[PDB]
């Protein structure tokens, strides 16, 4: 080590991000840090609702008898899939909504079950976050054309063992969806927070942004997207009010001169980056520690 700099100040962070100890004069884009705790907002059209609970039970116990080996692999495994009636084929979901639940039913201490993604495009616990399907069926035996999800038995500070797998089949579509769990009291159709950075799921579109009320009286549709596919706004189907969506931290532009930051172009009224004076230009706001009396 010859010399070091801590990435603590605003100029130091720019130097660290640019991977260089010196920065040439010019303009450099940067993004403010995102809030670390985000509320959740959900908007959804009410549809014909019936709810199926997919539940997977895992239990195992050791070989009772003269040899009590704890670290050994479990021998006998009970794995059930609720309503999965063997000969009838995979347990398919017919309901519009469904929820996946996991019941780690082992009693031995320090032993815990788990399920892994495998080669499926989704995870067991993560389907509940409003994932759409055209069809989906689970089974404890291989489905021709499906995917496999390993089921594992774990011991603390010890190596784990596979104790089976869950086979899934699916197709793309908009008819079936996964939800976390019904709770009596909460409206899953229009429950949003305004002017605060929030994580949202609005009419099957997930993202992070800020929601506000706006002018627009657009008559067609319920969602409005940009060329890139990002969601720019949506309409509450009851009132007809249209809400806009803005990113939580759009990029700024810092001005550096003589190895220091002298100004910053901003999109709003704030004395950001520690500058004590802010003015307004035709297209943007400008903040700097300047006295505004120079000529060159």
């Amino acid at each position: 080590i010859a010399n070091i700099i801590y990435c603590n100040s605003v100029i130091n962070r720019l130097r660290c991000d640019q991977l260089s100890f010196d920065v040439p004069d010019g303009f450099y884009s940067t993004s403010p840090i995102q809030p670390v705790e985000l509320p959740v907002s959900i908007v959804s059209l009410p549809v014909y609702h019936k709810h199926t609970f997919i539940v997977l039970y895992v239990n195992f116990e050791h070989r009772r008898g003269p040899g009590k080996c704890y670290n050994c692999r479990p021998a006998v495994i009970n794995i059930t899939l609720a309503n999965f009636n063997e000969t009838k084929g995979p347990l398919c979901v017919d309901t519009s909504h469904f929820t996946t639940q996991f019941v780690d039913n082992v009693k031995l201490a320090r032993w815990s079950a788990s399920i892994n993604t495998g080669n499926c495009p989704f995870s067991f616990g993560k389907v509940n976050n409003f994932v759409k399907f055209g069809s989906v069926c689970f089974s404890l035996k291989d489905i021709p054309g499906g995917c496999a999800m390993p089921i594992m038995a774990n011991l603390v500070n010890s190596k784990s063992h596979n104790i089976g797998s869950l086979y899934v089949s699916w197709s793309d579509g908009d008819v079936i969806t996964g939800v976390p769990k019904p709770v009596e009291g909460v409206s899953s159709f229009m429950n949003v927070t305004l002017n605060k950075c929030t994580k949202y799921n609005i009419y099957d579109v997930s993202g992070v942004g800020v929601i506000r009320i706006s002018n627009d009286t657009f008559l067609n549709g319920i969602t409005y997207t940009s060329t890139s596919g990002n969601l720019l706004g949506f309409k509450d189907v009851t009132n007809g009010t249209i809400y806009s969506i803005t990113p939580c931290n759009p990029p700024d532009q810092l001005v550096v001169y003589q190895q220091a930051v002298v100004g910053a172009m901003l999109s709003e009224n704030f004395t950001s980056y520690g500058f004590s004076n802010v003015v307004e230009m035709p297209k943007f706001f400008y903040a700097s520690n300047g006295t505004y009396n120079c000529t060159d």
Partner: antibody
Amino acid sequence: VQLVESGGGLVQPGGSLRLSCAASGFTFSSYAMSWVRQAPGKGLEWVSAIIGSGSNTYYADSVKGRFTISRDNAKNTLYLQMNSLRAEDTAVYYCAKDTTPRPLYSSGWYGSFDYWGQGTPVSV
Amino acid sequence: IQMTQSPSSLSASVGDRVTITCQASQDITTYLNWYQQKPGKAPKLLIYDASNLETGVPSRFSGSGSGTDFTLTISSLQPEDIATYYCQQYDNLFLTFGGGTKVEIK
């Protein structure tokens, strides 16, 4: 690993309290927690337990319907809500940590507490 | 579920071979914990699964049993072991502790 309880005191019968227990030194959301009380000069009695996620909560019959367990995984804090207290509810309350780590998407067994708090007195 | 431990109290000389039992009044198979509470302090876990010795307690302790009968033994009772011992089952999530048992030196 460390557990510290707080919120003990003296309240009239029929009152309410806000027992709290902070946790540090381990991944808090991976382990189930339970409150267990020791009446003065008596054996330990289990009061309530909550899994890591919080979907499942269990209560003993001597406390069923009167108390309410909760946990806030964002700031490693375990809570116990006491309502409609009686005379026999007076004891020292400990917050305990299970020994089996479990995935956050799972609901499972518990009962092998390896770490215990200092305990706090509650008088009525 | 109910648990009963015998004896309710006992006293033995240093280096002796104290043995304390616990019974479950119901088939518990192997799900039993053994705790130790020194006076005025929080309990500590000694044995889990009725026989698995914990990683921070000396091998002086040992536990055995199955079904309805269980037993905890101290190979050589040292002066540090004066405390109250408890057995706790976890076959049912509405778990219950025993009444305890106290040891004494002479």
